[PDB]
Design a protein around this ligand. Structure first.
Ligand SMILES: CCc1oc2c([C@H](CO)N(CC)CC)cccc2c1C
Lengths: 338, 232, 222, 54, 290
């Protein structure tokens, strides 16, 4: 009977919660009590990238830490040269409603997606000087919220149809489909080793997935609202989530618990994007207050702000060498900070 | 992605002839086009250039004010107007495409060129080696010298390499020191510093025999070097 | 450098094209289409000419882009903000749903579900200034229904006879009473006309009215 | 929805059958990763303008 | 035959204007009214500029022309204030150059105010007749029209100080400004007239366009009221002065000096009223005023 299984199901949650309590030896704040705070992190706009004529929703650095791509509701996907602020490419999109970007680790491809439920992949290193669309991945029933290349041939995507998928670009078919989320999946972050990935959903729950097997390993429960952003710690052994509750929290996969909550009573708006530093010592978050805060991930003190945007900070990224931070905004400007 | 040029032939001194190259198979409108000429028995020599959108036109000192270069993007064609041809203008005129953006490979595709026979402060690149004997398989190194530091402040060494097989157009191998072009075997490799440059081949074959050229791009007029033929 | 000079020239060439594209896009009129499954939005779209469906049509030298986002079937709160800045919101409601009920729920009227959606939309923080065009479809079938069935089934309180004019007026006025921003956004209600093709003309007229009012706003002459 | 309940109970059963380490050691691990790569983090410690590409 | 070595009296005594070696009760009353109007002008224009600059929301071209109008009216108030305290018995310490400086200040300030009104009318026409929703525009056109306005005002205020004055043609020139030639007064009056008629035409076109397009679907009453007041202030506060100048340059034996200072006072009251006419309708802009 349904009641039999439900009463049985809630008993499993009891064991999970009890085990989580038993392993909560000490709060991370206590362990990091003697760590010197990071101090005031005053970062300044070194380059201002102009040319987008609408809101910006997604950006993604390159692996060379010089090139970056950005998408905006104007229907343009622009590859920037951050060093010189000159535009390398301007890719027109078939659908102006784009909510994510991706720069392939090899630099040969970029991807984007949104309300069209398709992940379009573009080839940059062609032999005709132009940038051309390579494949169109059409197997989702809810708008695309995020996407990240694994290789030149594998891309994993999250959608608002409560499922994440893994694709084969050459064949254009889903090698694996990840299901189990009860709400719209907002963002996914790939592990450094490209063996796992976590996804945050509107059901206020984050799940760790296995790319090969296709089954969820862990599910982390936290604050009750749509998780809007998620990113891996650089070691791949943790991740931080940002939701509409105006809170960012740090989960761990090995401990399978929650360590920190980055909340300040003044902040009442929702977090739109999160991203770490090369050392993972700074957790940068782009809120709706028109500003981007910099959090000390090990002390939970707001040390740093990036206030240069007339509108909300949609996206926020760091380089592979951590020499810069770029932030998009609804004000149509990307700013390189350092 | 072919490039074909038209014109040339026999012209008496003092006449004016027009050279045209019709591009096909790529986005011509976003490529900067060059013209390079080769004497019947001497090396290459740059003559002209247009940037993308016809916004920058340069000429060689020996044709300045005499030649006029123009492009017609809608038809994907490149034109060269020549006036009062001198006896020193006998050469086969190549057309080269190039695109400049971070990481691109300029001078990557060369046309077949046309033959023109008239009836009758600049960096110098020097390579005093010619007809070096060699054999398929062995390791051979080609040396080049410059009169100026080609290493720019931004960190790019604008020295290129080309290979002209017997009866074929020049083919790019290395668009900048320590870089390899697309579609060329991995055997070719070149390293240099400052003004001393080298091109190394691990194992070669009967296919890669010919004359090797060196070109700099630090500043115009893109002076070439003398040929370096591999003997076989 | 020479390569750097060429790269800067390329970037300026890109900037010029971006500006031209933006100037071409600014002339376009962006319309958002909402409503229930059977409201008649499909019929309206047919009159005007997966995921998000875009319809482009030109009327009287004005370019309109209509976005039918009804095939999304996900949480609206996550992607509705993407439509901030549209000229208006065309909203469709079927007058013939007063006596019906959704095939899933027990006794929740379809008309009340449309009213719930309309209240959620017109009071949304993203559409404080955005005007709403309200289409009331299936009016003839509604007339046939009301000629035989009573209107009390949906609205418990109703002072009026079972006549099409008064019943339709009551439903319209009930729908126009949901908006609290009475002096900021204007609700333009229209009754669907099939052959006359006056639906596109009404959308045109409402769009020009909002454009002219905004023009008077930003210039200080109002 | 019976199969859904069965799959849910199996999902939670698999979730519970994993090794969990004490949070103190994981906190020390996160601190170790932060501090070991600290001096290579440009944002955390400024790098002089000579080696600053921006 | 020209004479610039003569003093002020040579022209005053030959045209009719009284030197007023001593003050007068009428002079005292008109002086009080003028100083009060000048203070009000300065205060209102300072408030307008401070509000237009403090709020980032009011950083768009129409508010820029509004602030330029406020600055021009401030300049007019200053010019009128300086003209006062230089009359009665204070108009005899002057020389040709210094009095020309005074009159040129007045002329440039008033010309700048009128030109700013015309520019506002033009920008309102442009904004109303566009067919787009947002139209993020540039700030170059507003500054270009601003520099045109200011250059025209300055050149108009300087031309009489250079060659367009009756230092050489003593017989043919005005009775109120003893040196300014009738040609200069006629030119200034005609400039004012064409500016006013262009404003009327532009606002009528705006009103007709809005009426037809919106009634195709109350805003008409508010638009009509705004148009009527903006035109009415101008017509009521300028027609007396312009007609008085035309009478000076046209009618022989028309006593126009007694009714001069009050009419000029009305003209300056025009600049006094401008900052409130163009700010009362703006709810938010009137909320930062508090
Ligand atoms: C326009 C109303 C008016 O302006 C007067 C002037 C000024 C002096 O700068 N100029 C004279 C052309 C015209 C602005 C002087 C004397 C009387 C008047 C009257 C009356």
């Amino acid at each position: 009977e349904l009641d039999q299984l439900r009463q049985e199901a809630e008993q499993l949650k009891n064991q999970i919660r009890d085990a989580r309590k038993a392993c909560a030896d000490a709060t991370l704040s206590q362990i990091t009590n003697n760590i010197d705070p990071v101090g005031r992190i005053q970062m300044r706009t070194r380059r201002t990238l102009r040319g987008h004529l609408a809101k910006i929703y997604a950006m993604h650095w390159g692996t060379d830490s010089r090139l970056l791509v950005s998408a905006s509701q104007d229907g343009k996907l622009i590859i920037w040269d951050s060093y010189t602020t000159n535009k390398v490419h301007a890719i027109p999109l078939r659908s102006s409603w784009v909510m994510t970007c991706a720069y392939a680790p090899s630099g040969n491809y970029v991807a984007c997606g949104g309300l069209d439920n398709i992940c379009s992949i573009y080839n940059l290193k062609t032999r005709e000087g132009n940038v051309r669309v390579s494949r169109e991945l059409a197997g989702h029933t809810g708008y695309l919220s995020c996407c990240r290349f694994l290789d030149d041939n594998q891309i994993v995507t999250s959608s608002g149809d409560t499922t994440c998928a893994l694709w084969d670009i050459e064949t254009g078919q889903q090698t694996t489909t990840f299901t189990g989320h009860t709400g719209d999946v907002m963002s996914l972050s790939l592990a450094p080793d490209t063996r796992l990935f976590v996804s945050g959903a509107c059901d206020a729950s984050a799940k760790l997935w296995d790319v090969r097997e296709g089954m969820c390993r862990q599910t982390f429960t936290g604050h009750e609202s749509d998780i809007n952003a998620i990113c891996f710690f650089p070691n791949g052994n943790a991740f931080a989530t940002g939701s509409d509750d105006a809170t960012c929290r740090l989960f761990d996969l090995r401990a399978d618990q929650e360590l920190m909550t980055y909340s300040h009573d003044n902040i009442i708006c929702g977090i739109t994007s999160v991203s770490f530093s090369k050392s993972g010592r700074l957790l940068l978050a782009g809120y709706d207050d028109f500003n981007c805060n910099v959090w000390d991930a090990l002390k939970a003190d707001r040390a740093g702000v990036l206030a240069g945007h007339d509108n909300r900070v949609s996206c926020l990224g760091v380089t592979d060498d951590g020499m810069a931070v770029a932030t998009g905004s609804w004000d149509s400007f990307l700013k390189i900070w350092n | 992605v072919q490039l074909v040029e038209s014109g040339g032939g026999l012209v008496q001194p003092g006449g004016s002839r027009k050279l045209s190259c019709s591009a096909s198979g790529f986005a011509f409108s976003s490529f900067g086009m060059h013209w390079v000429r080769q004497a019947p028995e001497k090396g290459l020599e740059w003559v002209a250039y247009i940037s993308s959108g016809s916004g920058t036109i340069y000429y060689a000192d020996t044709v300045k004010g005499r030649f006029t270069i123009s492009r017609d993007d809608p038809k994907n064609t490149l034109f060269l107007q020549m006036t009062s041809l001198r006896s020193e203008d006998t050469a086969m005129y190549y057309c080269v495409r190039s695109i400049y953006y971070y990481g691109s490979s300029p001078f990557d595709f060369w046309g077949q060129g046309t033959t023109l026979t008239v009836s009758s402060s600049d960096i110098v690149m020097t390579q005093a080696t010619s007809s070096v004997p060699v054999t398929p398989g062995e390791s051979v190194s080609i040396s080049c010298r410059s009169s100026k530091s080609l290493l720019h402040s931004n960190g790019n060494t604008y020295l290129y390499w080309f290979l002209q097989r017997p009866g074929q157009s020049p083919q790019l191998l290395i668009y900048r020191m320590s870089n390899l072009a697309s579609g060329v075997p991995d055997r070719f490799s070149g390293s240099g510093s400052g003004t001393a440059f080298t091109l190394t081949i691990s194992r070669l074959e009967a296919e890669d025999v010919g004359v090797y050229y060196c070109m700099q791009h630090l500043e115009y007029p893109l002076t070439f070097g003398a040929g370096t033929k591999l003997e076989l | 450098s020479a390569e750097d000079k060429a790269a800067v020239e390329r970037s300026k060439m890109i900037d010029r094209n971006l500006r031209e594209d933006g100037e071409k896009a600014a002339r376009e009129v962006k319309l958002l289409l909402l409503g229930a499954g059977e409201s008649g939005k499909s019929t309206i779209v047919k009159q005007m000419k997966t995921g998000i469906v875009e319809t482009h049509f030109t009327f009287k030298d004005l370019h309109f882009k209509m976005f039918d986002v009804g095939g999304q079937r996900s949480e609206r709160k996550k992607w509705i903000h993407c439509f901030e800045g549209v000229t208006a919101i065309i909203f469709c409601v079927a007058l013939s749903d007063y006596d019906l009920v959704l095939a899933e729920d027990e006794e929740m009227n379809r008309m009340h579900e449309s009213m719930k959606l309309f209240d959620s939309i017109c009071n949304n923080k993203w559409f404080t200034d955005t005007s709403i065009i309200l289409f009331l479809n299936k009016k003839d079938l509604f007339e046939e229904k009301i000629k035989k069935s009573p209107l009390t089934i949906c609205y418990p309180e109703y002072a009026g006879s079972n006549t099409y004019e008064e019943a339709a007026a009551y439903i319209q006025c009930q729908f126009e009473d949901l908006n609290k921003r009475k002096d900021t956004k204007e609700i333009y209600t229209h009754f669907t006309c099939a052959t006359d093709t006056k639906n596109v003309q009404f959308v045109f007229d409402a769009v020009t009215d909002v454009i002219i009012k905004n023009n008077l706003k930003d210039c200080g002459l109002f | 929805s019976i199969a859904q309940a069965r799959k849910l109970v199996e999902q939670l059963k698999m979730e519970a059958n994993i090794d969990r380490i004490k949070v103190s050691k994981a906190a020390a691990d996160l601190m170790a990763y932060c501090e070991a790569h600290a001096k290579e983090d440009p944002l955390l410690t400024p790098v002089p303008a000579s080696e600053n590409p921006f | 035959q020209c004479f610039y070595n003569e003093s002020i009296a040579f022209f005053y005594n030959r045209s009719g204007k009284h030197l007023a070696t001593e003050w007068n009760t009428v002079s005292k009353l008109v002086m009080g009214l003028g100083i009060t109007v000048c203070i009000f002008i300065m205060l209102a224009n300072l408030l307008v500029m401070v509000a237009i600059y403090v709020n980032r929301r009011f950083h768009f071209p129409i508010y820029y022309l509004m602030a330029n109008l406020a600055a021009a009216d401030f300049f007019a108030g200053l010019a009128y204030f300086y003209l006062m305290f230089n009359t009665g018995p204070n108009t005899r310490r002057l020389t040709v150059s210094t009095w020309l400086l005074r009159q040129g200040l007045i002329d440039t300030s008033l010309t700048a105010s009128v030109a700013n009104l015309l520019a506002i009318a033009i920008e309102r026409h442009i904004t109303v007749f566009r067919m787009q929703l947002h139209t993020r525009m540039s700030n170059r056109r507003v500054v270009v029209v601003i520099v045109v306005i200011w250059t025209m005002a300055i050149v108009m205020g300087a031309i009489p100080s250079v060659g367009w004055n009756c230092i050489c043609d003593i017989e043919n020139c005005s009775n109120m400004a003893p040196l300014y030639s009738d040609s200069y007064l006629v030119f200034w009056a005609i400039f004012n007239l064409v500016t006013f008629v262009v404003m009327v035409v532009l606002y009528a076109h705006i009103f007709g366009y809005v009426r037809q397009r919106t009634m195709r679907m109350d805003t008409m009453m508010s638009l009509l009221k705004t148009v009527v007041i903006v035109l009415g202030a101008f017509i009521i506060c300028w027609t007396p002065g312009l007609v008085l100048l035309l009478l000076d340059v046209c009618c022989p034996q028309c006593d126009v000096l007694a009714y001069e200072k009050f009419f000029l006072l009305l003209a300056e009251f025009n600049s006094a009223m401008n900052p409130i006419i163009y700010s009362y309708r703006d709810k938010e802009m009137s909320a930062t005023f508090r």
